[PDB]
Design a binder for this molecule. Structure first.
Ligand SMILES: Nc1nc2c(ncn2[C@@H]2O[C@H](COP(=O)(O)OP(=O)(O)O)[C@@H](O)[C@H]2O)c(=O)[nH]1
Ligand SMILES: [Mg+2]
Lengths: 155, 244, 424
């Protein structure tokens, strides 16, 4: 399966061998087992050139997986500021929700990616968005002792 | 009828050429894959090994080498599961050479506290016990109850408890248990009963109430008196809750 | 109960470790060559505790750290044999430190531990400094602990573990490493001082007004805290004298042995403290959450036990009064069912630079806030299963993460139980 080799590459980060596999017509939106496209995997492990290659060949920027995770979720979780702005520029879902009720703003706030938090907010993030337990991004800064984040959330 | 009468399987021809060097490698994953292969591909499928004219005492002495000394706890876990498989699918083989080649290594490695690893090491010790009943285990299990590591004490004593629940009464009452009962078994179980740690002591309390159940709460009433009245009622607690 | 063997593992381990040896070598009057140039007997009274030359073992998988220590100021003093270093590094992989690469080296380390313990009149216990978000300090350290725990079960295990925070390193696997390591410490150590990088940054940034704190800036706060809590151990004194007596009077339940340290006054790197504080001022740096080395609010929980160490010449009468005061004027914050749970001790020799100082070791249930933060970060990471192939590749099982997750949450619930408990 050529859609499975393109996931192997986009994950481990062999920039050159993506172009090889894609020139062989590999499925840009090929799902693995839990529904993760190559754009998901590259946006998780920080391979910026592989993200922009897949997006311009037609990668579902707002593709979800078995747990409702968009690539912007995973980029905002791990903290890849370079990739976050690339996805948003390609029409990413700034207020996407996943199976646990989190938005990308929730994940960037939990992991302390203050520089990414400000990017999401300026792209119209839902500051008052709630999760399953009922907590906003502002509640996380209150609960987690981060006053640098509380100030960045009320800006 | 013994269901073991089904035709037996042979595994010596299954081994690969690159194996002795892989298991005797410095890279952990070489050793792991080597062991993990012959276990999932070669041992796990079969259901009866070849009794006739098969020398496994070259293979088993390298499972011991890793179970004892190998620094990778993962390589330990997958090896003791191999050892169990051999002792399980080839019943009535581990007479002495086989049984004794892996016994004292296994008892040393109960020191491991990771649940998955203690699971595998103990379960293999149960395998050799069910087919090498009190051959060398009674003599060597006691030895490692006297050992300095706290974890090996509670586990090798739990081991004697496991073995004792499945004890055999063939012959008169001059089995290996009675030849060494008061001299060795009891003198060693009291060392556990009187340990500094509670969780250690609490294993001895079962391992003494499972002892009384086998050999009469009257015979051992002599060391019962020398014991605290406070520890006595804990020992009796298990005596009421332990079966045979 | 005399000698203490010291260990430092990982980059952070050797950093705050060497800083600690810098501080207390001065306080004891030892030069980098290893010769006494002091002028007091209270200095060499209990020098046999940490010295023989330090009773210190240096460990790291990263071999470069070797030279970062010896090329330091007091780097010449450590015994050459007690350097035990690997070829490659762990690279923020707890599994590499605990199961694969760190395990291959751990034997060489235990050989040196044995050697130093062999020549001890009467060992007290051990002392480990390390970081929890790393791969070596956390993975090999916690593995070293258990290996010592089973080789020396009649001895105390006391750790100075520093907690990762996004404010100091943006590495997202640190919640994994720290959570797995807490699962070890709750089962393997008698007492652990919780150094939170979150709180060290918030102190250097907000209280000391340093716009960008460096490691050296945070390490200054740590090394001073260590000498403060170890003041009882290193000088003559009645109360909290040895490691076991301390833990006996600090830890009422075996799993709940995570201390929230904090001390006063907070100074910068070599700044000038014009007017030495008064006794009531020092005392009022206890509840002051801006002095806690762990990012927790004591107001949000209850103190189980408290140990106070006042350093310097001052009124023992006034200290007793101020401590007895602050307890009963905030009686709802100290647990009622443990009477005389706060204990104070004084040492006449102050720390260098300061005329007076005060260290505040506290077992506060508020520490559950700290474990909440790590758990939420861990779970957010773990529910999306990020970077799991690192750990599983090194022989770990996915189940292990679930157990560590649940075991830390049980630890949080336990703290919450005793917080809501009543004497009635
Ligand atoms: N306070 C302090 N924390 C550190 C220092 N170095 C690293 N850390 C923290 O420790 C974690 C990194 O682990 P580290 O010790 O460098 O990895 P190791 O070499 O494999 O043990 C991160 O959370 C860092 O914030 C230091 O010098 N001081
Ligand atoms: Mg390192």
């Amino acid at each position: 399966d050529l859609g499975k080799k393109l996931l192997e590459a986009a994950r481990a980060g062999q920039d050159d061998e993506v172009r090889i596999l894609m020139a062989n017509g590999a499925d840009v939106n090929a799902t693995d087992a839990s529904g993760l496209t190559p754009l998901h995997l590259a946006a998780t492990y920080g391979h910026l050139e592989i993200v922009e290659v897949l997006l311009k060949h037609g990668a579902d920027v707002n593709a979800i997986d078995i747990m409702g995770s968009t690539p912007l979720h995973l980029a905002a979780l791990i903290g890849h500021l370079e990739i976050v702005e690339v996805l948003l520029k390609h029409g990413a879902d700034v207020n996407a929700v996943d199976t646990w009720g989190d938005t990308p703003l929730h994940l960037a706030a939990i992991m302390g990616h203050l520089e990414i938090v400000e990017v999401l907010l300026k792209h119209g993030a839902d500051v008052n968005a709630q999760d399953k337990f009922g907590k906003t991004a502002f509640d996380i800064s209150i609960d987690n002792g981060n006053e640098d984040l509380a100030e960045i959330l009320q800006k | 009828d013994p269901f073991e009468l089904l035709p037996p399987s042979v595994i010596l021809d299954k081994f690969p050429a690159d194996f002795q060097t892989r298991i005797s490698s410095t890279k952990w994953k070489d050793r792991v894959e080597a062991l993990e292969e012959i276990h999932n591909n070669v041992l796990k499928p079969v259901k009866k090994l070849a009794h006739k004219n098969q020398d496994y005492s070259d293979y088993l002495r390298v499972l011991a080498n890793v179970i004892q000394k190998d620094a990778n706890v993962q390589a330990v876990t997958i090896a003791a599961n191999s050892v169990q498989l051999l002792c399980n699918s080839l019943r009535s083989n581990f007479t002495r050479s086989y049984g004794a080649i892996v016994l004292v290594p296994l008892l040393e490695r109960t020191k491991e506290k990771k649940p998955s690893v203690n699971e595998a090491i103990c379960s293999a010790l149960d395998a050799v016990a069910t087919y090498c009943g009190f051959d060398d285990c009674l003599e060597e299990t006691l030895n490692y109850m006297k050992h300095k590591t706290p974890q090996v004490r509670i586990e090798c004593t739990k081991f004697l408890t496991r073995m004792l629940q499945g004890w055999k009464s063939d012959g008169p009452l001059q089995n290996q248990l009675l030849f060494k009962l008061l001299p060795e078994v009891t003198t060693a179980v009291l060392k556990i009963v009187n340990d500094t740690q509670p969780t250690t002591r609490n294993t001895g309390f079962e391992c003494f109430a499972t002892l009384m159940k086998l050999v009469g709460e009257r015979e051992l009433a002599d060391p019962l008196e020398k014991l605290d009245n406070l520890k006595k009622k804990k020992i009796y607690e298990y005596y009421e809750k332990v079966e045979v | 109960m005399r000698e203490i063997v010291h260990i430092q593992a990982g980059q952070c381990g050797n950093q705050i470790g060497a800083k600690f040896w810098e501080v207390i070598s001065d306080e004891h009057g030892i030069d980098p060559t290893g010769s006494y140039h002091g002028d007091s007997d209270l200095q060499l009274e209990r020098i046999n505790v940490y010295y023989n030359v330090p009773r210190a073992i240096l460990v790291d998988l990263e071999p470069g750290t070797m030279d970062s220590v010896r090329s330091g100021p007091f780097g010449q003093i450590f015994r050459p044999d007690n350097f035990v270093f690997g070829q490659s590094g762990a690279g923020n992989n707890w599994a590499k430190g605990h199961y694969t690469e760190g395990a291959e080296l751990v034997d060489s380390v235990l050989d040196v531990v044995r050697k130093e313990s062999e020549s001890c009149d009467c060992l007290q216990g051990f002392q480990l400094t390390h970081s929890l978000g790393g791969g070596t300090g956390s993975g090999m350290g916690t593995l070293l602990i258990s290996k010592i725990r089973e080789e020396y079960p009649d001895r105390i295990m006391n750790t100075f573990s520093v907690v990762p925070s996004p404010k100091v390193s943006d590495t997202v696997v640190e919640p994994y490493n720290a959570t797995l390591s807490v699962h070890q410490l709750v089962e393997n150590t008698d007492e652990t001082y919780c150094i939170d990088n979150e709180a060290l940054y918030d102190i250097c940034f907000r209280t000391l007004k340093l716009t960008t704190p460096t490691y050296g800036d945070l390490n200054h706060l740590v090394s001073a805290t260590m000498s403060g809590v170890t003041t009882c151990l290193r000088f003559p004194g009645q109360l909290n004298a040895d490691l076991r007596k301390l833990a006996v009077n600090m830890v009422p339940f075996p799993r709940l042995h995570f201390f929230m340290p904090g001390f006063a006054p907070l100074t910068s790197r070599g700044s000038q403290q014009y007017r030495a504080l008064t006794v009531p001022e020092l005392t009022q740096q206890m509840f002051d959450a801006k002095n806690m080395m762990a990012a927790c609010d004591p107001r949000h929980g209850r103190y189980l036990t408290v140990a106070a160490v006042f350093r310097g010449r001052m009124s023992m009468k006034e200290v007793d009064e101020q401590m007895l005061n602050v307890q009963n004027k905030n009686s709802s914050y100290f647990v009622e069912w443990i009477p005389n749970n706060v204990k104070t001790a004084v040492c006449d020799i102050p720390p260098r630079g300061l005329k007076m100082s005060a260290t505040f070791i506290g077992n506060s249930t508020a520490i559950q806030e700290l474990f909440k933060r790590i758990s939420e970060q861990f779970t957010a990471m773990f529910r999306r299963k990020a970077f799991l192939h690192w750990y599983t590749g090194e022989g770990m099982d996915e189940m292990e993460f679930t157990e560590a997750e649940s075991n830390m949450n049980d630890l949080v619930s336990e703290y919450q139980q005793y917080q809501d408990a009543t004497a009635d």
